[PDB]
Each structure stands twice: as C-alpha cells, then as structure tokens.
Design a binder for this molecule. Structure first.
Ligand SMILES: O=C(NC1CCCC1)[C@@H]1CCCCOc2cccc(c2)C[C@H](N2CCCC2=O)C(=O)N[C@@H](CCN2CCOCC2)C(=O)N1
Ligand SMILES: O=C(NC1CCCC1)[C@@H]1CCCCOc2cccc(c2)C[C@H](N2CCCC2=O)C(=O)N[C@@H](CCN2CCOCC2)C(=O)N1
Ligand SMILES: O=C(NC1CCCC1)[C@@H]1CCCCOc2cccc(c2)C[C@H](N2CCCC2=O)C(=O)N[C@@H](CCN2CCOCC2)C(=O)N1
Ligand SMILES: O=C(NC1CCCC1)[C@@H]1CCCCOc2cccc(c2)C[C@H](N2CCCC2=O)C(=O)N[C@@H](CCN2CCOCC2)C(=O)N1
Lengths: 210, 211, 195, 215, 236, 195, 210, 211
C-alpha cells in the first residue's frame, strides 16, 4: 500500500447515453508528499473505442501501457481490424495475472464502447481491475487509485443513469474534484475525456493545486 | 503543514496554512495553526495536532498564572524555556511538536523554535512542517529586514503558497498575522490557495500549468 | 547526497550538479566528473546516487546510445533516448537495481529543448524544471517562483545562482562547487560556479 | 519449526611454526574436540605435501581433511603433468587460489605451509580461511595462537630488548617450540594430549613427539 | 543445431571454402585506401541504376566508431553483419577500457571473427575482404586489410575487390609518403579509375582525420575526374 | 555532526566549534549559540550532540556550578568542575543518558590551563589537545603534528585555522563558520572565524 | 564484549621475593580504534600496601575507583589503621557483586602486601576479578583486560619464581610489552610500579606508539 | 591500514603501513600493501587481505595477457576500469577492497581509487584505510605539487606515521615507493614507526608523551 502512496493518483470511468467518460488526476508524486509533475496523464488511448486508465506506481504505469500498446498493435495489424473492447479487457486481465506473484503495482480501468454491428450500436463498456487481473464489469461507474473510497462515495451519491454528454461531463468532473479535494497525495489538475461514437472531447479542469 | 515567521523592521510576520491530515486523508482545511499564547506572544502549530494544541494551551495557563503572580508580562525567552523543559520531560514518549514562539517584550521582538526533542533555538527567521524547506527557500531568496508591512505580508503569502504547491501535506488557506509592539493584527484571516495559484503561477487560466 | 537541477526553456535547457565525490565522511574530490554523461548528438544524461552505480549505468547508457547512432548513422531523438534510459532502469529495477536518479536533457528539431525527470524507481515524466537529492527540497520552490516561459539563458543562470546560494546557506551539506551544462543554439557549453 | 543447521564447528587445536636459516619446525597438538568433549586424543593436524613441504591446519576437521587431501591430489597431478615437484612458493600460491575459490562459503581452516625452498631457506606461510597469506619467520594458528604468538615474538624478534640474542640453532628452536606448546596447553582448554613436532632440513622431514597434559 | 564441418582440408592441403569466399571477394567492387602523415583517403566503386536507384542508401564506406572507418569488397549482406559485429565490439571495448578502441585492435578482432568462421561447424566463411583505416593509441594513422581466411596486415596503401592487382601495381609506383590531402585524394581517384569507368557517379571518396570522416563533395570529384580525363587524353 | 576542538598550552587553552544549528537536512542557524557554556570563574564547558540534550545538560551543569560558587563564595577548581561534570553524565548514562560530548577548559592558580576530553559515555581524561565529532578524524592529526609546548596563542590560532581549512576542504559537511573561546592571561575572549 | 573493545587496555600483576609489581598500558581508546589519550593510567593506590588495576570501560573505571576510594577512606578513618589487602579484596568482590545484574564493565586486579605482624613480614598478594566479583587468588601473576590471552601466554612462559626487584621489573615489563605488541587496541605506553616494603619505583617504558 | 598516494612534479609517491589484523589481534606487522601490477603500475591494498591480493593478482594476469596480445602497455585508466568492472560484478557479495592504482603511461602520470562498490575516481591525491583521514589531514596541510623527491618522501612518511599514531588498525613499518617514467623505486623499504615516534613527537625520550 505504501508503494501506491509513493506516487498517488486515481482514475474514474462513467457512462451516459451513447457516451462514456474517463477522468484522472494529473499529479506525479514522489515520496508520497512531493509533487514533481502536474501533467502526468493516467489515461491512454488504445484505439478509438478503447481507453485505459492506469493509476499506481508510475514506472509500472508506463511499463504496462507500453506492453498493452505492443499487444494491441500486433493484434490489430494481424487481424486488420480494431480490437474489441472486451477482448482487450480480457487480455489486460491475462497480462496482469501472468505476473501473479511479482505483479505490476497498477490499478487499471478500461472505458470504451462495445460495438454490436447489425449501422452499428455503441454500448458503453466499463471495467475496473486489481493488480492481479480480477475484473469488475459495470454499467454506471468504475474507480481505482488511492482515492478509491472518496470516488466510491461521490459516485454512489451523485451518479445519474442515462445522462447526455454535458450531464455526464458535469457529473464525472464533480465526482472527481470532490474526491480529490479530500486526498493529500492526489490532484494538481484533472483531465476529463468524454467519448461519443462521433467525437472525443478532452477537457482540463480548473482544479485545486495544493 | 507549513508555518513560518520572520522579523522585519515593523515587527514579526507569522504565516501558516490550514490543512490537517489523518494519514493521506485531509481531515480539515480550516484548522487554526496560530495560537495566541498571550496578548503579545503567538504560537504556531506543526506536527501532532493534539500535542501542539494541548501544550500551547497549557503554556498559556502557566503564563497567565505567572503574569498574575508577578504583575508583569513574561518574556518570549522565558515562555520558550518553559515549553522546551516541559517537552523535554516527555522525551522518548513520542510527542510530535514543532512550535515557533514569536512575540514582543521589554527586550524587543523575539522568536524561538521549540520542538518535541527539547530543541530551543533563538533566531530571526524560522519555518516548520513538511513544507518548510520550500518556504525557507522562498524567504531566503527574497528576505530583507527593511521590507515594509505590505512587502513582508506579500512575501509570507507567496512563501506559504509555494510550500502548499509543492507539499501534499500543506494547503487550504493562508493566514498572515502581524505582531507589533501593542499586540498583533490578522492581516489575512484566511485566503484559499486555490486563487493564489491562478494568481501567481497560471494567471492566463487557458491550459494546465506544467511543472 | 548528489544535488541535480534541470531547467528547460523555449530556447535552452540547463543542467547543474554539485561537484563532490564522497567516500564515507570525506570528500574524495571537489571537482567530481562522474555525474554528467555527454552523449553525441546534443544529448546529456545527468546522474546521482552511488558512484559505482552511476558509473555503471551511465557508461552503459552512453555506449548503447552511441552504438545505436553508429549502426543507424543517425542521431537518436531525445524522447527515444529518455524512454530507452527509463526502460533499461526499469528492467534492472526488479533484478539488480541501479540506485540512481536521472535528469535527461537534449535538443532535436522535432521537439525542441526537452527535459526529463526520472527517479531511481524509473518513474519518469517530462518537466519544465526538476531536481534530485535532498537539496531538491531547497531549490524546487525557487525554480517554481522564478521560472517563466521566454526566460533567457542569462536569466536561467541567475535562477541557478539563486539555487546555489540557497543550498550553501540552508542545506546541511554546504555545497559551494557546481558544474553546469547549457544547451542552446546548437552547442553545448560547460560552466563551473563557486558560491 | 526447525532451526537452520549451521555448517561450521571448531574442533580446536593449535599449529605452531618456526623458521631457521636452513630448517623449519612445524608442531601441532593432536586433540580432537567437540564443544567441551574429546572425540579422540590422536588426530594429527599435519600432512606431508612433498619431501620438502608439509601443511598444518586448525579448525573444522572435515574441512581440514578434505583440503589436505585435495592439495595432495593437485600436487601429484602437477608432478605428473609438469615432471617436477612444485616448490613451497608454488604450493603457497596454489593454496591461496584453492581457498579463495570458496571465498563466499569458506573452508573453516587456518593453514600454515612449512617447507624449505631450493635455496635451503626455511619458509613459512600462514593463511586465513579465504586465502589471504603472508610469509613469516614464525606463526601460529588455532585456539592457542593468541597465547603463543607473543612468546615467539619475544624470543625470536626481541624488539623490546636492548641486550639482544643472536645465537639461534635447531635444538634451542625446538626447545622453544616445546615450551610454547606446553605454555599454551597450560591455558587453552582445546590444546593438549600430545604434540607432533615436524622438522624439515637438508636431509628431509623428521617427526618426533612430546606428551602434553591430558586435562 | 547444425554442426557439420563446412570448411575442411582438401587433399592438396587447402581450405576450399576459404578460396571460394576469396572468389566472392574478387566479384566485388574495388576499394582503395591510401595513408598519409595523419590522414587516410578511402575510395570505393559505386554501382547505381541512373534515376531509379537511390545512391544515398548503399554504403560501402562506413564509420565503425569515433575514429575508425571501414571499406569492404565482396558480399554486401555478409559485410553488414560483420560491420555490425565490429561496431558492437568497438563499444564493448570502450566500456571495458574507458578508452576508444584502437585501429589495430579492431583489425585483429575482425580477422579473428573471419578465422573463427572458417573453423566452426555449421557456418560458412564471410565472403568479404575489408580495409580498416583508423588511429592507433599513439595517434598514428594506420590501414589494415583483412581477408576471408582471417589473415591481416598493415599497409601504406592497398586495394581490395575486383581487379585489385592492377590497382596495387599502380599504387606501388605512384604512392609517396606524407602527401597532402588533395594529392592523396587525386591519387586515390586515379587508382580507382585504373580499373573502373571514369565518372563522378561511379566512385565514393572519403577522407579520415583525427576529427571525423568526411566524404568528398560531388563537384570536387567531378573536377578531379575532368583533370584525369585531360591527363589521359594528353598522354595518349 | 558538531565538531569540537580543544588545545591547551603552557599559557592558554583554546576551544572551537562549528556554529551550525541543524534540524534534519536544513541549517536552522549559521551562528548557533547552544554549544559554548561560559561558567563564572574562568571555566568553559563546550558540548556537542543533540541540541535538546546539549541545552538541558549544559544549563544544568552551569546552574549547579554557579550555585556551588554562590553558596561557598569561591570559585570551583577546574578539575573539580570536570569531575563533577563527568560524574553527573555518568549518573544519567544508565538512567536517561545525555547523548553529549564535552570539552572542559579553564584556568586556576592550582593547575594552570586545563583541558578535559569527555565523551557521551562519560569516558574522561585530561589532554593537551582533543576533538569530538566526525571532523575529529580530520583535525586530530593536524593537532598532533603542529602542537608543541611553549606554543603561543597566535601559533595556536594558526593551528586552528589549519584545522578549519581541512574541515572545509575534506569533510563531507563543508563547515566554514566557527566560534573560538581563548583563555589566557586571566581573561576569556570570543572570536568568530570564516574560512 | 564489544563494550570492552570500546576503550581497550590491560593490567598485569606479578610478585617476586619481598616485592610485587603492577603494570598497565596507558591508552584511552574511543570507538575501538581511535587513540584519544596516552597518559590514562589504570593503576590506583588505595594505600601504601594496596594497589588496584582497573581495565575496561573508562567511565566505569573512574566510577569504581571513586567508590573504592570512598570506602577505603571511610574504613581507615573509622578504624585508625591501614586497610588490610585481603579485606580490601573481599570488599571489592562484594561491591562488584552488588551490581550483579547491571554490572560495572571492569576487569580489576589487586596487588599489594599482606602484612603478618609478629617486626612485620610482607607477603606479596595478588588477585584477579571478573566484572561480578569472582576472585582468583594467586602467587605468581594475575592478568586482566582485552589483552588477557597474550599476557597469559607471556606469563606462563616467562614468569620466574622468587625474583628480586630488578628481575621482577625486567620480567613484568617484557611480558607486558610482548603482549601489547600483538593487540590493536592496547598499548601506547606502559607504566610499571615495583613495590617493596621500603619504596615504590614508578617507571614509564619506551614502548610502541602505534 | 593506511595507504596513500599523490602526484608531485617528479612523479607519484605511494606510501603504506604494514599491519594486518584479525579482529583486534595483530596477525602480522610485515605484510606488503603495495603490489606491482606491471612495470609501471603499482596497487595499494586496503580492506580485506584476500580480496585485495587475489583481485590485484588477477588484474596483473589480465594486463599481462593484454600487453602480450596488443604489444603495448596498458593505461592506468584501462586497468582501473577492468578492476572496477570486475569488482562491481561482485556487488552485494561482501567483498572488502580499497585500492589505489598509480602508474605512468603515454598519457602521463595517473592515479585512480577503486573500491569494492565499483567506485572509480580519478584524482591526484588519495588515501584509504582506517587511518586515511589522518593521512589526508596531514597531506592536505603540507601538500605542494612543487615538492622535490626528498620533501615528498618525507611528507609521505610523516603522514603514515601520524595515521599509525592515531589509528589502532595501522602500524608496523612505513614503505614509501616512488613511481617515475621508467618504473618505480623503493625509497623506504620498511622503517619501523617505533623510531618515527621518538623522532617526531618525543625526541627527548625523558617522559611519556601526552596527547
Ligand atoms: O494535521 C496534522 N497537523 C497539523 C494540523 C494542526 C497542527 C498541524 C497532523 C498530521 C500528522 C501528525 C502526526 O503526529 C501524530 C501525533 C499523535 C497522533 C497522531 C499523529 C495520529 C492521529 N490519528 C491517526 C488516525 C487516528 C488518530 O487519532 C492523527 O493523525 N491526528 C491528526 C488530527 C487531525 N485532526 C483531528 C481533529 O481535527 C483537528 C485535526 C493529526 O494530528 N494530524
Ligand atoms: O526488445 C525485446 N527483445 C529483443 C532483445 C533480444 C532480441 C529481441 C523485448 C520486447 C518485447 C515486447 C513485449 O512486451 C513485453 C513482453 C513481456 C515482458 C515485458 C514486455 C516487460 C519486461 N520488463 C519490463 C521492465 C521489467 C521487465 O522485466 C521487458 O521489457 N522485458 C524485455 C527484456 C529486457 N532485456 C532482457 C535481456 O535481453 C535484453 C533485453 C523484453 O521483453 N524485450
Ligand atoms: O553524594 C551523594 N549523596 C548526596 C546527595 C543527596 C544527599 C547526599 C552520594 C555519594 C555517596 C558515595 C558512595 O559511593 C557510592 C555508593 C553507591 C553507589 C555509587 C557510589 C555509584 C552511583 N553511580 C555512579 C554513576 C552511576 C551511578 O548510579 C552514584 O554515584 N550514586 C550517587 C547518587 C547520584 N544521585 C543522587 C542525588 O543527586 C543526584 C544524583 C550517590 O550515591 N551519591
Ligand atoms: O589486515 C587486514 N587488511 C590489511 C592487510 C593487508 C591488506 C590491508 C584485514 C583487516 C580486516 C579485513 C575485513 O575484511 C575481511 C574480508 C574477508 C574476510 C575477513 C575480513 C575475515 C578474515 N578472518 C577473520 C578471522 C578468520 C578469518 O579468516 C580476516 O580478517 N582476515 C585478515 C587476514 C590477516 N592476515 C591473514 C594471513 O596473513 C596475511 C593477513 C584480514 O583480511 N585483515
């Protein structure tokens, strides 16, 4: 647990109607109390329908992201198609478990769209992981990081089913900001990505910097 | 936590943040880290909240009794000696106390640092808490004994802000008190550092600041 | 402890370190040269930590990057160099770690002037300013306060001078001898500073 | 649970060496002990390596036996491969490398190499457990070493005596070795029973015995 | 893993695989290296289809490290693998000694690799001969020539590859010591064009100094080629 | 660490210390005044160690010796003072130790100029020269080499200057600020030295 | 164990005919390898017929010497006579044992004369102690200190019964010097006191200083 | 143990004591702490006796092979790099090695300090062992690059003497070798420090010296 306090950070996923959002704090801690960076994004785009949020030890975040990018790129070049979000989620579980006894100290979430080709229907997809690859498929929200308890409280209290993109943005941003304001080792900025089948909206929140 | 104090030509500036933590969870952002020991002596709290509060109120009681008994105002040096002896008596018990005692007395303006290990150091410029190295660097970089009150207050505010910016343990509000010959004034009762960041570091507010 | 400082602007990057070689309670040297690792092609790796680990890791990185540049008859990009460094440190982290902290700097036409901050756990991010060592506690706020975009090289050197004076005055180890690497205008210059 | 078994035991005993101009004396007691009991009163600590070189050791008896036998094997192999017997100096270097090959799991053996080189100089080398070695005029390993080495310093070097003695000879040196071992037996619980005194000089290696106290 | 002995002794007492590798080398382009007081000139034939092939890609004159360069004749792919091995060894030497590898050390290493590939089961020899120009530890300039058998020597000037005998004989009667950079370049051009068609696009030339390896510009080569054509016409 | 140095001659005794007050990795002060404890009657106690323990033990000794001198209307002998100090430290050693190292100096007509060296275990002996702290390793040989009987005060100060230069040059903590107490000719003088 | 290595030092007692000698090294160590003094005597005069040598931790040496001086002075003022050496030896044993469970880290020896009043006969008296007051009465020699093994070897080999004062001095000095030359943490001078019923001879030996 | 070396205008002085210890017991006073690596490179031994001896002999073998193979003399820098790499390969195994490599080569006079942790530091003046702080203080106090050979030897001897005087781990004999362009000379084969004390500190020899 102290390893997870070394850097800090958290990630949050939320779904609305034909939209899904992923948000993270921007701090890179060191020694649990020293802020060394304020632009360290925990959100990574695997493909247009698959994002991953990686909280935890920054070295393990970068390493796991590189492994996942390698695997996704190989899969998609071999298949000549975009990787389905569920296949990616299962793959991430398998990669994390392959290190079951010397694991990556990461707390991932996966957020994206499950495509169901008839036109195409875009069903929001959310999953939270533990460091050895246990999975929690969800429809409303997912959380991970040292701020997990605060995010859980905020989401359980504020989440509203079937919100449009603007309502989704306001809700996820409020949940993230309120949770971060109670954490000593997280914050220093927030990035919010709101996904729709047509566009991605990237926002940086005017957040607390202490 | 970040507390600091320094002498200048019009007296003593004392500035603190207002965050309290339980582990990495922020218990409060409105705690009061400057405690009036008496009409002319202010104490700052760093470290354990209960220890600082209890022993500074206990010192206040002792000083009240002394000043009734002897019909005179205690000196900052005597108050600091009393506190340091009391704390040294608890050595090895695990008290966490970082305290700066500042005040005016018949010997002029005085300032002492007292910690739980019994340390008692006279000086003209101190900082305690997790964020105290940052406050130190800012103050030493921009400290002049001939600053006016406005410059001294501005410098204290900026130092506290930078400490809270770099230290996860410090934040909330900045309070800047001014100690002078006839007591003390609260120049800044409490100002959220939120506005301070978008005032000093990122006034444009058009993109995320990059450390 | 080895104090490392880095500052990147629109037109430059500056790295600085103390010049002490320490063995138990004595200074072997006041002009240490085992911290800076100049790498062909406007790149520089600055390292702190134990001298043995510094020498091993730094010379390994330098030799591998030079090998890459000779084999491919081209200069490695600064970002590629930073992530190669981080990945090698992360490979050794779980096997036989190099207890070293790094500042990585360079210029290339693709990204301009770049500064990367990496710790001994191989936690890395690109930064505008950064520091390592116990003296980082005493210079980081100065870097924050006096840094701005469009800073000139002379202004940045004045900031570094502020940092050195603070280290001399307030740091328990009174560091007074420093070496600086200045990268700007397609040339790398070395300076030595005493406070 | 069960505690981790420790692979070392000191079986006690002393080995003493003393060079002369043309001879070397190597003596060792023969007690073999385990904690505060006596395994046997006759366990020789000196092995012959060559006509002009012997080795004496103190420490763990299993280690000493294995090391002496390994050195004898290596020396016989050297004789077959290179057609000549190795000098004391060659053997000294070889023993150093053999000991250091286990630098990280050491032999528990303190060894004195005694012999006469080609120039008929009495030679002594004394070792630590990991291969450090040095040439000396007198040496002592084992439980009694810190009792015996001062005595031989006093008699041989005479560094703290203004009126010195320079009449050294084989009989007096043997008498000094016997007195040193008896004095050690007086005070070291692990040294006693019986001592073998080896003398190497021009003719070759000669062995004699002296009785020590049994308590 | 394949382990058959490919290089073996013929009844005559020859390593026929080594001689066949020598034949491959003789099917390569010509390369010339000339030595001077503190610089060396290396030249090599160029073959490139006009307007379709890219000239900047194929590299027969390459830089091993800070101070050593190499030209080669024979099989290109063998050359690439050997050159990458040599660069790796250069850097390994630097790591283990804290000094750049001297030229003689690298020549010995290259020859050792080639010999080794004549003497290990399941591998054929490299079909390449190499010219290695660089500096010794006393900063003296030297040129070494290695061959598929693994034999090497140092030379004041040498040619390898196809028609190397004509170039060698030419260099014998025209090489002086301590020649100036321009005159050494001109001699190298004359030597290479003794056996290759006269043209600027048919030769690549480089100059090696303590500072770096610098290739001679196109216009300088064309001017020197016009000088050679003039001397040839005037001599006929 | 607190560097303490003492040198006694036929006609003087000189004590010297660094003037740093340290709180973890930062210097609270460059002009510390919690090391020297001047005691009425040509006596001086110099202490190193933790500041809290220094203050407690030193003020206790000073107050008790002043009490003795007021009650008996006389000056305590230097040797009596040294052994009272040692005995109090030894009393607290097995109960609640004061982790402090001491140099005790003074003059009295009975014994001339006296210097006592006492460590935190209350091991004490009278010495001609002595040092405490990690810098003792770097000043002791200089003290040995340049000391002789009949040394003058100016010569002794030059020796101390040699010691300070060595500490600044070779000691891991670059100590450059010092305070000296000079006792000679029935007067105690204070000096401050920067190297 | 290591406490005794902190300072170093050793003491040695020897008797001849109507004479007895006590000797010690002069070093005050610190941290087992730093020599801070070269005049730190381990020999203390209780009265004209009773000397004590105290090796071990210097603080405990000084403390125990002060306790013993207090006790001897009180006994002798009350009795109006010199304390007999055997009474003193038993008293020292009792004082050391009184601290049986938190002992003084000292390795004492007692050397002196037992007076047999008829005229008066002076019988040499020697005793060595451990830190809890166990006693070893001897006629030839006693040793104590970190150099004990070397002193034991030298004495067992060199001691000669019934030597006159000069022979006693030479023997004890040679034993001490040879033993000290093999110890890293003892030496730096030697004091030798040779006692007779008529006079005490105090000598400082020109010993090794490394 | 105390070893030291320094450059001066005529080359390099290398001086050592000769004591070997097993715990606090003196195993020998005649060990040889300067090891000829080759004709032009000397090594000093501090720390573990077996480790220093074995790895400096191993370095000697490596350098012999190198100089046969390449028909040239290795540099001090290369020898030090080889040794430092070999030692670093044993990190965590518990080797105890403090080594100073000094020599002459085509780059001039060179001196490196190599320890078991892989440290490799070029310099002009080094000291290793328990007594090295004392040697350092003496040398720094009296070091001048323009000393002649006699002055350099005298200074080395005095520094070794003071180290052995203050350090219980150092003693026996002082050896002072001189490295020059054409190899090295043993100026002082071995001189007992016993005489050195009664020559420097207490020449009167009429009473015990008082530290
Ligand atoms: O912020 C703080 N100091 C600043 C704020 C005022 C002055 C400066 C400190 C920061 C860490 C202090 C470490 O030293 C301790 C000394 C004694 C005890 C404890 C800690 C453990 C105790 N714990 C841990 C969980 C259960 C519990 O009781 C605990 O951390 N207490 C909180 C109090 C926070 N609030 C309590 C009520 O509201 C006011 C403040 C506390 O002392 N924090
Ligand atoms: O380029 C490579 N291979 C070349 C080198 C030889 C010939 C080919 C591959 C790249 C393959 C990419 C696939 O993604 C991963 C698959 C599995 C594991 C990991 C990543 C994480 C693992 N990590 C991360 C930090 C700690 C650690 O152990 C890690 O990166 N392993 C490195 C091996 C590193 N060194 C081993 C010795 O050989 C030289 C390289 C590795 O797999 N590299
Ligand atoms: O003067 C004293 N009494 C006055 C003070 C009150 C009224 C009278 C007596 C002197 C009596 C001398 C007899 O010899 C000893 C007898 C027994 C024990 C010890 C020595 C060793 C013991 N030691 C030595 C160091 C560690 C330790 O425990 C020690 O000296 N005990 C001290 C008591 C010290 N405290 C007493 C009150 O004041 C504060 C200090 C002590 O007995 N003093
Ligand atoms: O003096 C010494 N260094 C100087 C002398 C030469 C170079 C400088 C060192 C000083 C301490 C070294 C600490 O690092 C160690 C590394 C490995 C092992 C051991 C210690 C333990 C080993 N022990 C302890 C008891 C049994 C045994 O084997 C042991 O201390 N060995 C002695 C060797 C003494 N002599 C042996 C033969 O004769 C020549 C030297 C030894 O290394 N001393």
């Amino acid at each position: 647990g102290s390893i997870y306090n070394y850097n800090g950070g958290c990630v949050l996923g939320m779904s609305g109607s034909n939209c899904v959002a992923i948000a993270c704090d921007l701090r890179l801690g060191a020694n649990t109390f020293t802020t060394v960076s304020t632009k360290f994004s925990k959100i990574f785009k695997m493909n247009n329908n698959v994002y991953v949020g990686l909280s935890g030890l920054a070295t393990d975040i970068q390493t796991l992201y590189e492994i996942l990018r390698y695997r996704v790129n190989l899969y998609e070049v071999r298949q000549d198609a975009e990787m389905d979000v569920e296949c990616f989620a299962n793959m991430l579980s398998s990669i994390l478990y392959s290190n079951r006894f010397s694991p990556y100290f990461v707390n991932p979430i996966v957020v994206g769209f499950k495509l169901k080709h008839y036109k195409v229907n875009y069903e929001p997809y959310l999953t939270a992981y533990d460091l050895i690859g246990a999975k929690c498929e969800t429809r409303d929200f997912v959380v991970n990081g040292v701020t997990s308890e605060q995010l859980f409280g905020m989401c359980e209290s504020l989440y509203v089913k079937d919100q449009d993109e603007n309502g989704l943005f306001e809700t996820i941003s409020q949940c993230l900001l309120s949770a971060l304001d109670r954490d000593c080792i997280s914050g220093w900025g927030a990035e919010v990505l709101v996904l729709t089948p047509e566009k991605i909206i990237k926002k940086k929140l005017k957040a607390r910097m202490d | 936590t970040t507390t600091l104090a320094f002498k200048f030509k019009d007296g003593i500036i004392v500035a603190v943040d207002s965050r309290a933590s339980m582990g990495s969870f922020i218990s409060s952002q409105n705690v009061e880290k400057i405690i009036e020991i008496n009409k002319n002596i202010l104490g700052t709290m760093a470290g354990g909240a209960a220890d600082c509060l209890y022993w500074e109120k206990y010192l206040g009681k002792i000083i009240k009794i002394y000043e009734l008994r002897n019909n005179e105002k205690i000196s900052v040096r005597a108050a600091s000696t009393i506190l340091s002896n009391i704390l040294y008596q608890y050595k090895g018990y695990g008290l966490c106390c970082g305290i700066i005692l500042s005040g005016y007395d018949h010997t002029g303006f005085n300032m002492f640092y007292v910690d739980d290990s019994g340390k008692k150091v006279e000086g003209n410029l101190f900082s305690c808490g997790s964020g105290s190295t940052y406050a130190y660097s800012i103050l030493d970089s921009a400290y002049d004994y001939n600053l006016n009150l406005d410059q001294a207050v501005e410098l204290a505010r900026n130092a506290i802000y930078h400490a809270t910016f770099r230290d996860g343990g410090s934040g909330g509000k900045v309070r800047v008190f001014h100690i002078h010959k006839n007591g003390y004034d609260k120049i800044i009762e409490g100002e959220d550092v939120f506005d301070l960041h978008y005032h000093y570091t990122n006034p444009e507010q058009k993109d995320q600041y990059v450390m | 402890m080895d104090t490392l400082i880095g500052l990147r602007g629109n037109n430059f990057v500056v790295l600085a370190a103390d010049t002490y070689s320490i063995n138990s309670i004595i200074k072997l040297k006041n002009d240490d040269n085992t911290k800076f690792y100049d790498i062909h092609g406007n790149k520089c790796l600055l390292l702190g930590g134990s001298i043995g680990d510094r020498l091993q890791f730094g010379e390994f990185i330098r030799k591998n990057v030079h090998l890459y540049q000779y084999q491919n008859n081209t200069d490695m990009f600064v970002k590629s160099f930073a992530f190669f460094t981080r990945k090698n440190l992360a490979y050794y982290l779980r096997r036989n770690p190099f207890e070293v902290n790094c500042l990585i700097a360079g210029y290339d036409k693709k990204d301009g002037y770049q500064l990367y901050w990496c710790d001994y756990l191989s936690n890395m991010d690109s930064v505008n300013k950064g520091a390592h060592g116990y003296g980082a506690y005493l210079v980081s706020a100065i870097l924050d306060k006096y840094y701005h975009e469009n800073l000139t090289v002379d202004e940045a050197l004045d900031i570094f001078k502020l940092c050195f004076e603070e280290l001399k005055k307030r740091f328990l180890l009174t560091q007074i001898n420093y070496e600086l690497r200045i990268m700007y205008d397609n040339k790398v210059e070395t300076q030595y500073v005493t406070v | 649970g069960f505690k981790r078994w420790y692979p070392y035991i000191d079986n006690g005993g002393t080995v003493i060496g003393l060079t002369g101009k043309d001879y070397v004396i190597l003596a060792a007691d023969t007690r073999l002990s385990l904690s505060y009991s006596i395994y046997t009163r006759f366990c020789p600590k000196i092995s012959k390596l060559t006509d002009k070189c012997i080795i004496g050791s103190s420490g763990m008896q299993s280690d000493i036996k294995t090391l002496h036998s390994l050195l004898q094997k290596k020396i016989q192999l050297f004789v077959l491969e290179h057609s000549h017997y190795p000098d004391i100096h060659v053997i000294a270097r070889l023993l150093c490398v053999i000991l250091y090959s286990r630098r990280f799991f050491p032999y528990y053996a303190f060894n004195i190499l005694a012999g006469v080189d080609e120039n008929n100089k009495g030679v002594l080398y004394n070792y630590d457990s990991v291969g450090s070695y040095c040439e000396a005029t007198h040496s002592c390993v084992g439980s009694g070493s810190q009792l015996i080495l001062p005595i031989l310093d006093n008699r041989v070097e005479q560094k703290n005596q203004l009126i010195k003695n320079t009449n050294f000879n084989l009989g007096d040196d043997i008498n000094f070795v016997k007195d040193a071992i008896t004095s050690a037996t007086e005070r070291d619980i692990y040294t006693g029973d019986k001592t073998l005194i080896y003398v190497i000089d021009k003719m070759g290696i000669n062995v004699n015995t002296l009785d020590l106290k049994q308590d | 893993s394949y382990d058959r002995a490919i290089t073996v002794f013929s009844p005559d007492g020859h390593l026929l695989q080594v001689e066949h590798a020598l034949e491959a080398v003789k099917k390569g382009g010509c390369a010339v290296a000339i030595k001077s007081s503190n610089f060396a000139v290396l030249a090599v034939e160029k073959k490139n289809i006009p307007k379709l092939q890219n000239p900047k890609t194929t590299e027969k004159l390459i830089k091993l490290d800070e101070h050593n360069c190499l030209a080669f004749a024979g099989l290109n792919a063998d050359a690439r693998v050997l050159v990458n091995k040599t660069r790796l060894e250069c850097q390994r030497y630097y790591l283990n000694m804290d000094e750049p590898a001297p030229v003689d050390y690298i020549a010995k290493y290259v020859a050792k690799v080639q010999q080794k590939f004549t003497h290990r089961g399941g591998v054929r020899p490299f079909g390449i001969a190499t010219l290695i120009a660089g500096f010794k530890n006393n900063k003296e300039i030297c040129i070494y020539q290695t061959e598929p058998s693994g034999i090497y020597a140092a030379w004041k000037a040498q040619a390898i590859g196809k028609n190397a005998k004509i170039v060698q004989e030419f260099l014998e009667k025209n090489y002086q010591e301590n020649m100036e950079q321009k005159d050494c370049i001109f001699l190298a051009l004359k030597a290479i064009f003794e056996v290759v068609e006269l043209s600027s696009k048919n030769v690549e030339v480089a100059l090696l100094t303590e500072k770096d390896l610098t290739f001679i510009e196109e216009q300088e080569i064309n001017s020197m080629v016009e000088l050679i054509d003039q001397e040839r016409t005037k001599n006929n």
